[PDB]
Design a protein around this nucleic acid. Structure first.
Ligand SMILES: Nc1nc2c(ncn2[C@@H]2O[C@H](COP(=O)(O)OP(=O)(O)OP(=O)(O)O)[C@@H](O)[C@H]2O)c(=O)[nH]1
Ligand SMILES: Nc1ccn([C@@H]2O[C@H](COP(=O)(O)CP(=O)(O)OP(=O)(O)O)[C@@H](O)[C@H]2O)c(=O)n1
Ligand SMILES: [Mg+2]
Ligand SMILES: [Mg+2]
Ligand SMILES: [Mg+2]
Ligand SMILES: [Mg+2]
Ligand SMILES: [Zn+2]
Ligand SMILES: [Zn+2]
Lengths: 259, 96, 146, 1371
DNA sequence: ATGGTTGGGTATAATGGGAGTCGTCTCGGATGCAGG
DNA sequence: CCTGCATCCGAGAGCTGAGGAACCCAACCAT
């Protein structure tokens, strides 16, 4: 078992990149995107559809839009006289380069994500969201600026991880902005406690937050931030009493009321 | 519990004692009209305060909970009659 | 191990403060505990009461500290003994662990005395928990009290 | 509404799962954090599961009824009952298929057995660690072609699917030794420190420098990593063309004139294994295209491929390269497993396995049989194997996983909501990654996580670490944990419940009550009978309506005094049920008529305390109210305490005098003995009277007058009738204990007035003087056993009503006489005999001698220890004898002696500990201290002796604590194995029977000895005679129920040598299906009459066996100077003993051959001879030149039941099991009939194994019920086919219970996952035959008043029947 | 028409984890390895 | 080729009562 070591092994089974290979792959991806848009202009079809069919042909039969239409469009692309099959070639090469770049940079995602444990998401969920951010960064990277890929990719990986944490960490979903409000309130209260030598009051937290903040608003914000408890929480030393055994039902009418 | 105005537990061994006595109707009353036959317990209370005798019991709610939870494990549990045709215990409230 | 204090009367709280538990975080499991952990070991003499324990499924897993016993800095229970020198009982009191106690012959606290001298030919004693009969010359320590 | 007759369980197809659901759950949102309302398409959506409010949509456009079946257009919520939120399911559509863990992790795996894959291989494929091959497409691995169902590692699949290539770095300042595009053979060095490993072409990767001539002289250009080289190696360039392209135009390299291009100092070299094809114009195939040999690549077909591979087109070198790789289709995970399962043809596999069954090897035969079991289950049920893989996951209705708001404004929720949220999150992320064309590693990881999420939802913690909520260690409760266990749905909510109309309170003794009465507190009864009370107050004028009466009763100070009289009116004639936990047997619940009392305690009759096992140091009881007329009738006729006077386990009285009642009756019926006279001789009675007047002779001294024994009291006081004697007692003339002469029933009895008073008490209680005179034993003191015999005889001769009246009279008079008798306990009552001192001094001498014999060498350590132990044991026995002799001779009326002799309280061991000495004590290891405790409890122990006894006290306490759980577990197993056995008919018509033996072989193997009276009574009383018997000039006909007098007659005839065994009907030979018949069961032991048809005898048997074990079988153990419960458990589970004896396999004669190194026993018969080699230290029960039958033991120890079944037969093993189980209960003084053990054993011997299928569709080695194989054989014989050959089996109670046909009972018993998986695979149907299934469904059990034999009875009066008859005659 | 909520982007470079568990006793089957 | 025998894994272990860790900007649907 232990899927973390399994994934780490699969990750380390791919060699890292040097500057030459990384810049070569990024350039190949950029030229592939340019070739894709040129091909779309030549054939008159949508860039998205042509990108999808080219990616399907690159990934092959292993990855399961249907074979009929993709084969039709792939043959229509083979109908180009010359100087356009070249664009098709650069498109395919750029897609292969995109795949290779993502695979090679998968380790930075793990290195970043190992610092966000213990915040309501498991390690592998954090890794997968970081992978999504990495794919975004590969999509948006620009090698002309002579910047190392990790420099640009770290921002997108962090954005993906934080958005995932704010979106999927609570049983009751809270909007992103108000999650940031809760986190800011917690940080403010913690620093106030550190300075005061005791737990602050709602008035002091309101004053420290700034304008537009009073004790009632702080109370409401702390009220909504409560997480639900488990109906299966054990009660007592023995494993025979749970929490939900003490909670009556108020919806269904009682026999007295029905009579 | 007394703090929750609760009832006493009629556990497995009490059911065994009732079975050993051959008290079939008493045991069925404990299982349905007094625990979780909702329609049954409502009708029993109404009949007792009206002066009549308690009516016949129905399926306990706990069996319906069991059926629904077995369905959640992707198991098809069906109640059939003497001709192996399905009988609906949910009163048509769970069929599209 | 942090328990709602029992305070029905003063003795209830005093009893609660002297409780010793084999259970808890990092301890034995009641359903898994066998017979060896619940026994009255011979080294419990003077350190853990052989009588006071729960009657149900916790019998032997919760016990009480004996009246004269003291827990040291290393966490081992010690009990006191009077030093007997040449058949004469002194007032020097030594607190021993079970390991040190296993080394000596210890006489009973009801041994007859004339002044502070063992006035009996035959003395009931313990040697590594074994009841033995010895002469007063072989006695090295003596119980303080029942 | 049709009635439910069967329950079927089966597998659910994805179509079935999707037809169940009311919509797809697509979002992990539960409720809106602000409005607390369900979110759209989440786990609580009203559009899927139903409205929160009754007949009201979410938005509120519709808020009334008769909108049923109307879905609001604005909100999409159907207008109907809100209760549908606990019935309607949802579903989740998985992006990729996932496997149901129940069919993977349930050993042996169903999927693995169907596909012939091991557990390890299934784990590797399912969790994405290995590929499995489907359509190999002619690929080659290590020179061997790949085949279907082959497992490939990552490297193996990578080389087969993409090719081979290695890139080698080149250090700066070191140049390669080969050109670009040149082939390399393994070992060809490309650098002074670099040697290639794989054959194929070598290509440059980022050459650092470029050399270009100029038409010639050379020149160099350094190339930095941020720029690329466009020109290929070894090609001409023109003036104005760019060579090394760069980001910046001013950094580009453009040759000034013509020249060639060469590349030097490569950054790395990439060696591949591929084919090379140069071209000059447009190509056909692009990069990423896989081709076969002889395909068109470029030049309009001029170049063609020679190998399979993947195409890469290099435009710099204008060449197409075919990397050698294949198009093998190997998959991972549940998609691959489902693909394999969909292709499986079950009939061809069945034929192949049927052919495999004929292999000579038995291991291969077992493997084929196990596979055919699953294959045939799938073929018969109609399920498809691919349905074991989940495509749509069902979602439980929200009201069964509630999100409730606690009274404090917080929320509480189930773990299923978190599990569903994790599953939905991972599914959505997988869909997003798939639509985004992610690499294969990320998709593999996400699919693995999805499989784990489904596993956690279905069965958490079964594989890997269980899922826990963040910040907490507690595992989440999954659906499996909900279903199974002691806290699961089955055992906690279906087989037992909490009930209405119940209460509980402390119990108090009720000496003034009758046997059918209990004292019930007034407040308890007001709450318990509240609706009846409301109706009664309505009938009167206390309240105008029911609501007013309820409001009145709500407030304590608002209650009037007429409501109490109304309450007395309400409960008139009704009964309540009293129950004390634990309910070990059925007499733990009893029906009593309530008497309303002031106070808060329930008053309990003294005579039911033994049936309840209740005393009065804080015990509590529960009160239940049966509601309907049927329930009240059942409680009053079947459960009333005054109707249950005999024990169902043994047939002995269970309501009987005890404690103070016994004490008082014994005190008044014991006569005085005096020694002042002491056997003097007198000639005439006047002289005896004169000597008594002088004071020389006491009144009760045994003197001799005129040559005959008598006393002064017998001559002095002659009374004309009992009234005169009791008048003399009331005047102080004589005591109740003085022996006088009374004329009674026309006979001059020499007896005491107390015995005459006791006779009058009985005669007046039963209202018949002659029968009462016949019942009692006049000339003995009344103690426990004589009083029990009196109660049993009164029952037999008069009935339960008169027996209950007699019981109440005996209770009253016993209490009255023990109050005034003067019984008390002082310290001087523990009399110390003088002999004890002597016995100690003698011991002190003998001990010395032992030490001497040890000092001089004649004794070793072990022998000296044994001698000391034996000496102290004998001294303890002597002191016990001396104590009891001293009591008998000197103090016949002593309180301890009276208590122990009458049976009221105590046994000799405790009295010895009080008076004589405590004795030897055992160390915690189980060995005995050398020095005993020589003091008693009266003298007082010393500190050391007390500490020595503490070890035994603690050991006894811990033994009780363990034995309780073990015995409860045994009782539950027995109930599960016997619960369906009911008395279903009058007679099965069988002619088989069993023979109860009246003699047993001796211990020392001397000869046959008559059995104990109790054993024969337990084996014979109440049984039906199988054949006619003729003993002592009395003919007992066939079909006669054996009463206790008949049993005594049979014992008397056995003692005269006329009979050796009795043939009786038994449950072991009954042919009734699903139960027994009336004749084969015999008496209802609690009624001393034939059993009624419809009685649940299996439950009674289980309770009768289990109740004694709970405490009796090895109560407070007293630490004073293989076996027990484990032996019974071993016998019932049919386990092979550790000290298993050796039993002769066949008949023969015995020849013992012992050598200096080995010992052996030979059994030699006229046909064959066998040899048994056993360890030399073993003990033999056989002598040389002896005759031994088949199965006869040759060694001391426990006999393996399976070996006995193989050797001797099924009747032999049944007899052995019954006898060996009864031995343990007899050792503890427990009386229990053989019927119950025979019921359980008949269940244990229920199955057969097929050895030869004959002309049937059975398989060899298949285990099935004996009834089924018998019916199949009967059909085959009728139709003219070869019979099925079978052999009997023996399995334990656990395995026999788990092998039952009903899946509901087995699932509710134990091992729920296995039972449910097997039943679902087979499509099993439950016929609801036993009691557990009907209890689970809340149905009327088929026993007692629910039996088909009695439940259709009608009742009608004469006038109505006449009217109906006339109506029939008219038409 | 106003807050409430949702989506996109930030550019030096960063590239394989962490808490943990060792005081249960049995039994029955499944399974791989030793021998002939 | 057969067989038995260590080895390992999983499911059991009485009832009742009481007990509680970034921020910013810009647009878009809801009401
Ligand atoms: N069913 C059942 N009855 C019990 C149990 N323990 C005690 N009893 C009954 O309750 C009576 C009084 O119990 P005691 O041991 O005196 O006291 P308690 O009420 O259990 O409470 P404490 O000793 O204060 O812990 C006993 O004599 C038994 O009849 C138990 O675990 N189960
Ligand atoms: N865990 C438990 C503890 C107790 N019980 C039940 O309560 C009773 C208490 O006996 P007890 O211990 O009060 C008898 P004791 O005073 O020693 O007996 P004596 O006067 O006859 O000599 C037991 O017999 C069981 O029925 C239980 O079911 N589970
Ligand atoms: Mg107690
Ligand atoms: Mg008692
Ligand atoms: Mg009691
Ligand atoms: Mg006279
Ligand atoms: Zn609506
Ligand atoms: Zn029969």
């Amino acid at each position: 078992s232990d899927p973390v070591r399994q994934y780490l092994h699969e990750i380390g089974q791919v060699p890292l990149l040097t500057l030459e290979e990384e810049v070569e792959l990024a350039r190949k991806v950029e030229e592939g995107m340019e070739a894709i848009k040129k091909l779309s202009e030549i054939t008159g079809l949508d860039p998205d559809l042509i990108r999808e069919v080219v990616r399907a042909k690159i990934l092959g039969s292993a990855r399961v839009l249907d074979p009929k239409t993709v084969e039709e469009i792939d043959q229509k692309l083979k109908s180009l006289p010359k100087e356009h099959k070249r664009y098709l070639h650069i498109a395919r090469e750029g897609e292969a380069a995109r795949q290779h770049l993502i695979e090679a940079n998968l380790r930075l995602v793990v290195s970043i994500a190992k610092k966000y444990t213990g915040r309501g998401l498991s390690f592998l969920d954090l890794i997968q969201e970081g992978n999504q951010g990495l794919i975004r960064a590969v999509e948006k990277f620009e090698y002309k600026r002579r910047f190392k890929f990790s420099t640009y990719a770290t921002w997108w990986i962090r954005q993906a991880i934080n958005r995932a944490i704010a979106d999927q960490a609570r049983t009751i979903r809270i909007p992103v902005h108000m999650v940031e409000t809760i986190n800011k309130l917690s940080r403010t209260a913690r620093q106030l406690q550190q300075e005061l030598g005791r737990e602050p009051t709602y008035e002091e937290i309101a004053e420290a937050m700034g304008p537009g903040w009073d004790a009632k608003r702080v109370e409401e914000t702390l009220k909504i931030a409560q997480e639900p408890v488990s109906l299966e929480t054990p009660i007592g030393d023995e494993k025979d009493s749970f929490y939900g055994d003490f909670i009556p039902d108020e919806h269904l009418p009682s026999p007295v009321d029905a009579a | 519990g007394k703090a929750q105005f609760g009832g006493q537990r009629f556990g497995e061994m009490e059911v065994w004692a009732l079975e050993a006595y051959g008290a079939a109707h008493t045991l069925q009353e404990m299982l349905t009209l007094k625990s979780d036959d909702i329609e049954g317990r409502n009708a029993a209370y109404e009949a007792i305060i009206k002066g009549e005798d308690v009516p016949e019991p129905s399926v306990p709610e706990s069996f319906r909970v069991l059926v629904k939870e077995l369905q959640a494990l992707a198991l098809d549990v069906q109640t059939l009659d003497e001709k192996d045709n399905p009988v609906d215990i949910f009163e048509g409230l769970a069929s599209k | 191990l942090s328990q709602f204090k029992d305070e029905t009367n003063p003795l209830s709280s005093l009893r609660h403060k002297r409780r010793i538990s084999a259970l808890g975080p990092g301890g034995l499991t009641r359903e898994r505990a066998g017979f060896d952990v619940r026994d009255v070991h011979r080294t419990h003499y003077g350190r853990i009461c052989p009588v006071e324990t729960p009657e149900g499924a916790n019998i032997g897993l919760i016990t009480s500290l004996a009246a004269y016993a003291r827990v040291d800095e290393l966490g081992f229970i010690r009990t006191p003994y009077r030093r007997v020198v040449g058949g004469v009982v002194t007032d020097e009191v030594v607190y021993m662990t079970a390991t040190e106690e296993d080394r000596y012959t210890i006489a009973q606290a009801n041994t007859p005395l004339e002044g502070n001298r063992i006035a009996a030919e035959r003395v009931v004693a313990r040697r590594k928990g074994e009841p033995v009969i010895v002469s007063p010359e072989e006695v090295e320590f003596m119980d303080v009290s029942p | 509404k049709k009635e439910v007759r069967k329950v079927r369980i089966a597998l659910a197809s994805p179509e079935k799962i999707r037809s169940w659901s009311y919509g797809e759950v697509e979002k992990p949102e539960t409720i809106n954090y602000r409005t607390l309302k369900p979110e759209r398409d989440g786990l609580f959506d009203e559009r899927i599961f139903g409205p929160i409010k009754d007949y009201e949509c979410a938005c509120g456009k519709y808020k009334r009824q008769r909108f049923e079946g109307k879905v609001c257009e604005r909100c999409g919520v159907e207008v109907t009952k809100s209760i549908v939120r606990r019935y309607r399911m949802g579903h989740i559509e998985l992006a990729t298929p996932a496997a149901h863990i129940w069919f993977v992790k349930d050993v042996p795996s169903k999927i693995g057995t169907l596909l012939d894959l091991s557990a390890t291989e299934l784990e590797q494929v399912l969790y994405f660690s290995k590929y499995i091959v489907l359509d190999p497409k002619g690929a080659i691995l290590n020179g061997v072609p790949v085949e279907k169902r082959q497992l490939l590692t990552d490297e193996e699949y990578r080389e087969l699917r993409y090719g081979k290539q290695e890139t080698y770095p080149l250090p700066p300042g070191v140049d390669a030794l080969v050109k670009d595009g040149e082939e390399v053979v393994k070992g060809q060095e490309l650098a002074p420190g670099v040697v290639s490993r794989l054959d194929g072409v070598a290509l440059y990767r980022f050459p650092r420098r470029v050399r270009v001539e100029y038409v010639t002289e050379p020149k160099d250009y350094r190339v930095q990593p941020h720029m690329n080289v466009v020109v290929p190696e070894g090609a001409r360039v023109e003036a104005g063309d760019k060579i090394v392209a760069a980001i910046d135009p001013e950094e580009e390299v453009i040759a000034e004139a013509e020249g060639v291009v060469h590349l030097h100092e490569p950054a790395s070299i990439l060696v591949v294994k591929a084919r090379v094809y140069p071209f000059e114009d447009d190509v056909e195939v692009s990069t990423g295209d896989r081709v076969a040999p002889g395909d068109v690549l470029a030049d309009g077909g001029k170049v063609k491929s020679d190998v399979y591979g993947r195409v890469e087109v290099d435009l710099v070198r204008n060449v197409v390269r075919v990397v050698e790789s294949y198009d093998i289709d190997a998959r991972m995970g549940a998609e691959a497993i489902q693909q394999l399962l969909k292709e499986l043809d079950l009939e061809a596999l069945e034929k192949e396995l049927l052919e495999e069954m004929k292999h000579p090897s038995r291991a291969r035969r077992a493997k084929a049989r196990k596979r055919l079991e699953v294959v045939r289950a799938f073929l018969d049920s109609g399920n498809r194997p691919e349905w074991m893989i989940l495509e749509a996951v069902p979602v439980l209705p929200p009201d069964l996983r509630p999100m409730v708001q606690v009274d404090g404004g917080r929320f509480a929720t189930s773990d299923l909501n978190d599990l569903y949220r994790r599953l939905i999150n991972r599914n959505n992320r997988l869909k997003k990654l798939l639509a985004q064309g992610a690499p294969e590693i990320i998709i593999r990881n996400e699919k693995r996580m999805l499989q784990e999420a489904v596993d956690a939802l279905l069965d958490n913690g079964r594989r890997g670490a269980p899922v826990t909520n963040p910040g907490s260690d507690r595992p989440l409760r999954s659906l499996t944990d909900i279903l199974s266990g002691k806290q699961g749905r089955f055992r906690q909510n279906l087989l037992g419940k909490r009930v209405d109309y119940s209460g509980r309170s402390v119990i108090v003794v009720g000496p003034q009550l009758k046997l059918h009465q209990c004292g019930l507190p007034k407040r308890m009864a007001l709450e318990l009978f509240k609706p009846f009370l409301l109706k009664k107050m309505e009938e009167k004028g206390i309240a105008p309506n029911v609501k007013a009466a309820r409001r009145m009763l709500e407030r304590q100070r608002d209650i009037k005094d007429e409501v109490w009289d109304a309450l007395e009116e309400v409960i008139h004639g009704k009964v309540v049920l009293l129950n004390r936990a634990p309910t070990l047997h059925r007499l733990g619940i009893q029906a009593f008529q309530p008497v309303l009392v002031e106070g808060q305690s329930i008053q309990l009759h003294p005579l039911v305390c033994e049936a309840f096992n209740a005393d009065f140091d804080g015990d509590q009881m529960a009160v239940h109210v049966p509601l309907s007329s049927f329930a009240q009738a059942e409680a009053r006729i079947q459960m009333l305490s005054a109707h249950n006077l005999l024990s169902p386990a043994s047939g002995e009285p269970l309501a009987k005098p005890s404690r103070d009642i016994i004490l008082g009756l014994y005190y008044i019926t014991q006569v005085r003995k005096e020694k002042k006279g002491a056997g003097l001789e007198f000639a005439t009675p006047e002289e005896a009277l004169a000597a008594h007047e002088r004071g020389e002779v006491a009144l009760n001294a045994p003197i001799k007058v005129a040559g005959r024994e008598t006393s002064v009291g017998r001559l002095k006081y002659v009374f004309a009738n009992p009234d005169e004697a009791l008048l003399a007692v009331a005047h102080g003339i004589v005591d109740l204990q003085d022996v006088v002469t009374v004329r009674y029933m026309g006979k001059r009895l020499e007896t005491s007035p107390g015995r005459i008073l006791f006779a009058r008490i009985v005669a007046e209680a039963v209202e018949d003087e002659k029968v009462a005179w016949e019942l009692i034993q006049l000339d003995v003191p009344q103690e426990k056993n004589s009083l029990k015999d009196l109660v049993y005889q009164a029952f037999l001769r008069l009935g339960m009503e008169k027996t209950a009246r007699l019981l109440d009279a005996l209770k009253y008079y016993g209490f009255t006489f023990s109050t005034t008798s003067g019984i008390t306990i002082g310290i001087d009552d523990a009399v110390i005999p003088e002999e004890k001192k002597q016995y100690l001094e003698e011991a002190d001498r003998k001990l010395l001698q032992i030490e001497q014999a040890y000092e001089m060498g004649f004794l070793t350590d072990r022998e000296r220890y044994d001698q000391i132990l034996q000496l102290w044991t004998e001294t303890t026995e002597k002191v016990t004898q001396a104590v009891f002799k001293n009591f008998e001779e000197n103090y016949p009326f002593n309180p301890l002696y009276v208590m122990a002799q009458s049976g009221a309280r105590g046994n000799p061991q405790q009295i010895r500990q009080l008076c004589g000495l405590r004795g030897l004590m055992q160390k915690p290891s189980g060995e005995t201290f050398e020095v005993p405790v020589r003091s008693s409890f009266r003298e007082g122990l010393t500190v050391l002796e007390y500490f020595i006894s503490s070890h035994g006290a603690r050991k006894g306490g811990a033994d009780t604590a363990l034995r309780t759980a073990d015995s409860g577990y045994l009782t539950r197993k027995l109930v599960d194995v016997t619960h369906e056995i009911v008395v279903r008919e009058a007679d099965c018509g069988t002619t088989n029977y069993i023979s109860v033996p009246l003699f047993q072989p001796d211990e020392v193997t001397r000869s046959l000895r008559l059995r104990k009276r109790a054993d024969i009574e337990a084996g014979l009383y109440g049984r039906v005679l199988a054949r006619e018997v003729e003993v002592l000039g009395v003919r007992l006909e066939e079909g006669r129920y054996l009463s206790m007098d008949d049993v005594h007659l049979l014992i008397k005839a056995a003692e005269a040598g006329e009979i050796q065994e009795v043939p009786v009907r038994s449950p072991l030979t009954c042919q009734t299906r699903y139960g027994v018949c009336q004749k084969c069961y015999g008496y209802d032991l609690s009624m001393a009459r034939p059993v009624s048809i419809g009685e649940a005898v299996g439950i009674v048997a289980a309770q009768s066996i289990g109740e004694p074990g709970t405490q009796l079988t090895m109560r407070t153990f007293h630490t004073g100077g293989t076996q027990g419960l484990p032996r019974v458990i071993e016998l019932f589970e049919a386990r092979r003993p550790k000290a298993k004896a050796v039993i002769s396999e066949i008949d023969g004669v015995v020849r013992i051959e012992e050598t200096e190194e080995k010992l052996s026993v030979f059994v030699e018969s006229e046909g064959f001879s066998k040899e048994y080699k056993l360890p030399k230290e073993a003990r033999l029960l056989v002598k040389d030149g002896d005759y031994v039958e088949a199965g006869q033991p040759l060694t001391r120890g426990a006999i393996d039941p399976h070996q006995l079944l193989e050797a001797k037969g099924p009747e032999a093993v049944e007899r052995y099991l019954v006898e060996e189980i009864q031995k343990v209960y007899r050792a503890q003084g427990v009386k229990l009939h053989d019927k119950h053990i025979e019921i359980v054993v008949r269940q244990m011997m229920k199955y057969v194994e097929v050895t030869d299928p004959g002309d049937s569709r059975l398989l060899e080695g298949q285990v099935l019920e004996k009834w089924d194989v018998e019916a199949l054989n009967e059909r085959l014989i009728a139709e003219g086919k070869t019979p099925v050959a079978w052999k009997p089996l023996l399995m334990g109670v656990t395995k026999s219970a788990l092998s039952t046909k009903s899946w509901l009972s087995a699932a509710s018993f134990q091992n729920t996952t296995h039972v449910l998986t097997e039943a679902a695979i087979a499509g099993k149907k439950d016929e609801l035959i036993g009691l557990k299934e009907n209890v689970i469904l809340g149905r009327l059990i088929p026993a007692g008043t629910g039996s088909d034999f009695v439940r259709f009875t009608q009742v009608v009066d004469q006038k109505t029947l006449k009217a109906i008859e006339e109506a029939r005659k008219e038409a």
